[PDB]
Amino acid sequence: TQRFDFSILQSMAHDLAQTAWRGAPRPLPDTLATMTPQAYNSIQYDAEKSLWHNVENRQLDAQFFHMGMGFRRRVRMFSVDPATHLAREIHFRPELFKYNDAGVDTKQLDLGFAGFRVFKAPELARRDVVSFLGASYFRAVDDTYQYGLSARGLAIDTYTDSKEEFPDFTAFWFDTVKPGATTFTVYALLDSASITGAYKFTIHCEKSQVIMDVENHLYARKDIKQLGIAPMTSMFSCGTNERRMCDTIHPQIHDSDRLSMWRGNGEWICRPLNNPQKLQFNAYTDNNPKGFGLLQLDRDFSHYQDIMGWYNKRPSLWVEPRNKWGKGTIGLMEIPTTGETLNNIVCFWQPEKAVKAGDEFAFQYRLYWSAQPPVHCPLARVMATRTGMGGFSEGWAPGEHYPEKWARRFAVDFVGGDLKAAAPKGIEPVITLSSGEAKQIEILYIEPIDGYRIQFDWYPTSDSTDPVDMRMYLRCQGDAISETWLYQYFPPAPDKRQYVDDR
Template sequence: MTSSFNRREFAQLTGGLLAALGIVAPTGEALAEVRLGKPEPFSFDGLIAAMKEKAAKPYVPPKTRASDILDKIDYDAHWKIQFRPDHTLELGGGKAPIRFFHLGRYFKDPVGINVIDGNTAKPVLYGPDYFDMPKDSPARELPKDIGFAGFRVMEEGEKKDWLAFLGAAYFRSSGELDQFGMSARAVAIDVAMPTPEEFPRFTDFWFAPLETGTLTIYMAMDGPSITGAIRMDCDRSKGVVMDISAHYFMRKDIARLGLAALTSMFWFDELNARNGKDWRPEIHDSDGLAIWNGNGERLWRPLNNPPTVMTSSFVDQNIKGFALEQRDRNFDHYQDDGVFYEKRSTVWVEPKGDWGPGTVQLVEIPTDDEIHDNIVAYFIPEKPAKAGDEVAVDYRLHWVAEEPYVPPVARVWSTRAGMGGVPGQPRPKGVIKFVVDFEGGGIGKLGQQDGVEAVVEASSGKISGVYTLPVVGTERWRAVFDFTADGTAPVEMRLFLKDKTATLSETWLYQYHPGTLVPLD
């Protein structure tokens, strides 16, 4: 899997439900405001230099304290430990209130929390009085200076959070539609490789004074093969936009270094709902990978819940952007009024500067439930990451309802599949029909007389019965084709719409696993 803890538990922890029973303040502890330690010099340049120096030394894993006690703080015990609002770290005159997470079974190693003042920073000093906890909570047995697991940033008024850092080098935002879903992480190391995946962790955070509409967070990252210094400027004026400047230093050779990594969940949608075991019509945080490649072509790859781990690579030069998107915003397609999948963020990666040659890689992992993050997407530079190398990358993350740079051509609206052939006639064995709808880019104004055609290709097998038509009562066009596989190996498909003079749509890409959508016999 792509994480070491249950994603549903993480969502509950970052969402923060108040415990209703048996919660009391630690005995003998007096209420207090945030306590800060002695100032130390701080600058981003200094942090970069420190992490470069650290990468030249052997990795020293964190020494977990009181591990046996932390093991007792499972999900149920953890969510009952509630942060005290009167200990909130107030930044920017209340524009970015920050609250902290307690340690537990899934988050055993503390992180440093610091507040910047000019060219110095003061650490936030932990105390058990920051939290309310039940009388029988194992947390009461922990050392009084055990530390914090992470933090979340609240909205003004402090009723909801919109940004959370908890676990490894992950972070999440509720985005434009105010609903937590997928995660981002600084890097992805050796995902879907024969060797175990590596999870470096954020070890320290520094909060800078707010400028207009922004919160600046600096992060130190450390792991067996890599260190990092990251600056993140968060803007909430429209959706949530993060400007990120990252410097990574290699301790060891890394076979697969994924930058600007995104992690999501896909179980099933309208295309493969037959394989779902749930009463809801669709369950996913994201339904496709979008790419804007260096040649200006827009690609849309619907996500799969494959029969085995699959890695797809999209080689490019000077990529303009990529995203894991949630395009389907119709509540009726999900029917879940508890977690609201239709409100999950699209997260778009916008490179800043020239990223050069490299590959967008998509990893899809089989899952049988919605609690697992089974989708990963990231960018791999063409140059291999070797011990002693520095990789510097700048980019912008958009946590939005709609991708920020909508193409001027039609986009994929939906992908469906069923039995091939013609209704009312004997259905040919082994034939599956694909139906792809497109909308936008002015395509709804075209009629049958305008010569709209579908160009369809497949890496193997036979394509037949291709046709297009406008969908009555909508602004959409539909492309239809039958496909006959010539084996059981995955098939790469490609489709787009055109007329006599121009391309009319983005390019639909799909990886078909014969027999998984409709039985072939």
């Protein structure tokens, strides 16, 4: 046993920061390194040796992950008696696992735990609802039980003139779960070349969501180009907007469709996610952000047709800062993807002030894992962003030839708020553009969602292929009556603003 609490973990992290980084894990055995995802996920932990097996009337239990594939960090695991503030280490032993000890090619296999996952009544040994695995990455599910997007303890150099640094959770301490409890507490040591951290997660496993109360203290070993707080990681391959990568049986493929920001000044932003041809970074200035999230608001199975991944059942993630974070940017990185496996969306909070060796930080935030975020704009909300050819009347698209003029059609569909009561008074879109002009601007009632479509044709004013930034909110009798739609469009090359008639 040893003395353990959050204060001791902070000293540990602080003291670790004054010693040289332990460095990258040793390479795995080849049987583990070359192991397929299907083989990796078939590894069987001995349910009789579950972390909380000895707790009467337990509503939660926990098991560990084996090292394998890219998961090569030994993670040290401890049980904490919260009454006595005493931690005991749980030692890896091979007998805890089956189907871990032969490779893809049957070749027979020091090792350790790679992470943990938590199960809930009524299924204490299957269908885990929280999981920590790989670097500082974790995920949770809601009542659909379907895993989608990830969070991380921290992001470092995700978008800068040098390679991303991935911090690792190197140790977790589990408070022994109480009888009847659907909340558990886990402490984590974060360790990286640039930075150490002490984390406390108080994790609420509710009927329809997981709520994590996160507290961290960070201690910078080195100058850092980019510090990303409360990082989220998702994937967008094909949605309703700029469908360049949609050649599958699935009308849409994504773990999230949008970035949602509740700003320091009280403004709501809806930023539809892109799968761009070229790597893209955006930084959104804010001061005391109230919340931000990567949201999956299209719940319609018929929009995905995925009976393996169930994208339509995947959760939203909402970050709620528990203090004033001051000046900084919401960073959004969008990687070009051809499919599903690449985590091509990253979002984080980057404080304004440049990070120096010896800097300390303390952040508190709540994570909400659920179909809907816990808060949304009370005004009209963007339901979907659609793009395609413009330069013709809806209902009368020419079949005999392509449109004579090149333009890109935008349809932004709004629902909820006070659209019903406002419509008779007159609803106007307020559209600003970094380039081009919005023509044939229409405000059209959409009976099947009881909503309004703002449709316009973007005509280029420049041959430039620079990203085109767009903002739109609805006004009525001198008030904003919708959240702000913020879009980034990639116009084609000049010689591609025309149609090849291949028939």
